[PDB]
């Protein structure tokens, strides 16, 4: 089964990112983080497309689905911690600002929960 993935940002894209957003981040660090996010997305949808601790993950996934979330691909901050070596902390969030800026993902909120939908 095919699963949507977020592409690396390009150098020109990186170059165009407003300097302040970039700050500490190098080009490679950003795409390093994209790599981990895709890993989190992949892992989630394999589970969804799967026929036991993994299976209470499945229900949390269902539970998070929204009118606005549709048949779209998404993850939430807990997914990072669950599937990757990334920490969903402060730098992850600076990074998020870049990912959003480059239209790589969007933030969906509702039910007191922030979902990250793959653009």
Author numbering: 1 to 51, 57 to 124
Give sentences copied directly from the paper behind this entry.
Originally discovered in a proteomics screen, the Ska complex is now recognized as a key element required for maintaining stable KT–MT attachments. The ternary Ska complex, composed of Ska1, Ska2 and Ska3, localizes to the outer KT in a KMN-dependent manner. Although GST–Ska1133–255 is not strictly equivalent to the FL Ska1 dimer in the native complex, and thus might bind MTs differently, it clearly interacted with MTs more efficiently than Ska1133–255. These observations suggest that Ska1133–255 (from now on referred to as MTBD) is the major MT-binding element within the Ska complex, which, on dimerization, can bind MTs more efficiently. Here we have used biochemical and high-resolution structural analysis to show that the human Ska complex interacts with MTs through the C-terminal domain of Ska1, which forms a variant form of winged-helix domain.
